[PDB]
Amino acid sequence: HHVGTFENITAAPADPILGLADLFRADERPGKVDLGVGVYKDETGKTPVMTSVKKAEQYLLENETTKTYLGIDGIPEFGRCTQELLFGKGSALINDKRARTAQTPGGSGALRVAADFLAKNTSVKRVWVSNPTWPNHKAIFNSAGLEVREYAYYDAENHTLDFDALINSLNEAQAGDVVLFHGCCHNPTGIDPTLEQWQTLAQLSVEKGWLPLIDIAYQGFGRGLEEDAEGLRAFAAMHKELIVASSCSKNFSLYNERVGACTLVAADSETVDRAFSQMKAAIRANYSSPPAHGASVVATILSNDALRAIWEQELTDMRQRIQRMRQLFVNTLQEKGANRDFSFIIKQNGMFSFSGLTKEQVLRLREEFGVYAVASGRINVAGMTPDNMAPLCEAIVAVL
Amino acid sequence: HHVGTFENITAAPADPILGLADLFRADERPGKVDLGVGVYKDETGKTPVMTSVKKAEQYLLENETTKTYLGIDGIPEFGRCTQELLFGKGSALINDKRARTAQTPGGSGALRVAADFLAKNTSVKRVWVSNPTWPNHKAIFNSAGLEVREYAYYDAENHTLDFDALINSLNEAQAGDVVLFHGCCHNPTGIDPTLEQWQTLAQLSVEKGWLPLIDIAYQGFGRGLEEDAEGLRAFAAMHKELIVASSCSKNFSLYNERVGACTLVAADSETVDRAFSQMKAAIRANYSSPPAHGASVVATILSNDALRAIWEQELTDMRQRIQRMRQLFVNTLQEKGANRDFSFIIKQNGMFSFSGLTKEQVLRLREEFGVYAVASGRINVAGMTPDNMAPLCEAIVAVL
| Gap between the Cα atoms of B356 and B348, Å rounded | 14
Nearest chain A Cα distance for residue B12, angstroms: 5
Which experimental method was this entry solved with? X-ray
For chain A, counts of helices (H) and of strands (E): 14, 13
Q: Which residues of B touch A4 (CB under 8 A)?
A: 240-241, 266-267, 271
Nearest chain A Cα distance for residue B42, angstroms: 12
Query: Residue B10 gets which letter from DSSP?
Result: P
B19 Cβ contact list (under 8 Å, min separation 6): none
For residue B125, the chain A residue with the least C-alpha distance is A5
Query: Residue A175 gets which letter from DSSP?
Result: B
Considering only CA atoms, which of B67, B66, B281, B109 is closest in space to residue A249? B67
Cβ(A353)–Cβ(A345) below 8 Å: yes
φ, ψ for residue B380, nearest 5 deg: -115, 105
| Gap between the Cα atoms of A116 and A181, Å rounded | 19
Q: What is the 3-state secondary structure (H, E, C) of A357-398?
A: CCHHHHHHHHHHHCEECCCCCEEEHHHCCCCCHHHHHHHHHH
DSSP-assigned states of every residue in B32-98: -EE---SS---TTS--PPPHHHHHHHHHHHHH----PPPPTT--HHHHHHHHHHHH-TT-HHHHTT-
B107, burial (CB in 10 Å: exposed 0-12, middle 13-18, buried 19+): buried
Considering only CA atoms, which of A282, A317, A341, A227 is closest in space to residue A113? A282
Cross-chain residue pair B256–A109, CB shorter than 8 Å: no
Beta strands A178-182; A211-216: pairing state: parallel
Q: Which residues of B touch A285 (CB under 8 A)?
A: 112, 136, 139-140, 142-143
Query: Residue A338 gets which letter from DSSP?
Result: -
Mutant choice from B3, B5, B123, B247 vs A, greatest count of A C-beta within 10 A: B5
Cβ(B59)–Cβ(B300) below 8 Å: yes
Cβ(B130)–Cβ(B154) below 8 Å: yes
Burial A308-343 (b: 16+ CB within 10 A, else e): eebbbebbeebbebbbebbebbbebbeebeeeeebe
Cross-chain residue pair B139–A285, CB shorter than 8 Å: yes
> Distances from the Cα of A74 to the Cαs of A270, B67, B197, B306, in angstroms?
21, 21, 40, 33
Across-strand partners of A158? none
Nearest to A68 among B39, B70, B105 (CB): B39
Nearest chain A Cα distance for residue B116, angstroms: 9
| Gap between the Cα atoms of A134 and B278, Å rounded | 21
What residue ranges of chain B are covered by domains with CATH 3.90.1150.10? 15-48+320-400
Task: Provide the annotated binding site of B for L-aspartate.
Answer: 38, 134, 187, 378
What residue ranges of chain A are covered by domains with CATH 3.40.640.10? 49-319
Q: Is the peptide bond before A132 cis (omega within 30 degrees of 0)?
A: yes
| Gap between the Cα atoms of A391 and A371, Å rounded | 9
Mutant choice from B287, B296, B314 vs A, greatest count of A C-beta within 10 A: B287
B287 Cβ contact list (under 8 Å, min separation 6): A104, A105, A106, A108, A109, A112, A258, A287, B105, B109
Half-sphere exposure of residue A353: CA atoms within 13 angstroms, side-chain side? 27
Answer yes or no: A210 catalytic: no
Nearest to A140 among B58, B67, B285 (CB): B285
| Gap between the Cα atoms of A247 and A261, Å rounded | 7
Sign of CA dihedral A108, A112, A117, A122: positive
Q: Which residues of A touch B12 (CB under 8 A)?
A: 277-278, 280-281
A378 labeled part of a ligand binding site:
yes
Residue A83 Rama label (left phi>0; alpha psi -120 to 50; beta): alpha
CB pairs under 8 A between A and B: 244
| Gap between the Cα atoms of B133 and B188, Å rounded | 7
Across-strand partners of B144? none
Cβ(A221)–Cβ(A319) below 8 Å: yes
Cβ(B87)–Cβ(B247) below 8 Å: no
The CATH superfamily of A15-48+320-400 is Aspartate Aminotransferase, domain 1 (3.90.1150.10)
Nearest chain B Cα distance for residue A168, angstroms: 20
Cross-chain residue pair B208–A12, CB shorter than 8 Å: no
Structural Rg of chain A based on CA atoms = 22
Cα angle A394, A395, A398; round to 5: 85
The CATH topology of domain B49-319 is Aspartate Aminotransferase; domain 2 (3.40.640)
Cross-chain residue pair B11–A291, CB shorter than 8 Å: no
Nearest to B291 among A211, A241, A258 (CB): A258
Q: Which residues of A touch B277 (CB under 8 A)?
A: 11-12
Q: Is the peptide bond before B132 cis (omega within 30 degrees of 0)?
A: yes
| Gap between the Cα atoms of B134 and B65, Å rounded | 39
Which spans in chain B are helix H? 16-26, 51-63, 76-87, 92-95, 106-121, 137-143, 163-169, 195-208, 225-228, 230-238, 269-284, 292-303, 305-335, 359-369, 389-399
Spot the catalytic one: A134, A198, A210, A311.
A134
**In chain A, what is the straight-line distance between the N-terminal and C-terminal CA atoms, in Å?**
63
Beta strands B126-131; B178-182: pairing state: parallel
Nearest to B287 among A5, A66, A109 (CB): A109
| Gap between the Cα atoms of A80 and A303, Å rounded | 10
Query: Residue B183 gets which letter from DSSP?
Result: S
Nearest chain A Cα distance for residue B11, angstroms: 4
Catalytic residue numbers of B, as ranges: 134, 215, 250
Nearest chain B Cα distance for residue A335, angstroms: 34
Cβ(B375)–Cβ(B362) below 8 Å: yes
Query: Furthest-apart CA pair in chain B: how many Å?
Result: 72
Q: Which residues of B touch A258 (CB under 8 A)?
A: 105, 287-291
Cβ(B287)–Cβ(B104) below 8 Å: no
Cross-chain residue pair A255–B136, CB shorter than 8 Å: no
Considering only CA atoms, which of B344, B346, B367 is closest in space to residue B356? B344
**In chain B, what is the straight-line distance between the N-terminal and C-terminal CA atoms, in Å?**
62
CA A283 to the chain's CA centroid: 21
How long a stretch of residues is chain A?
400
Residue B111, amino acid: L
Mutant choice from A59, A249, A256 vs B, greatest count of B C-beta within 10 A: A256
Cross-chain residue pair B285–A61, CB shorter than 8 Å: no
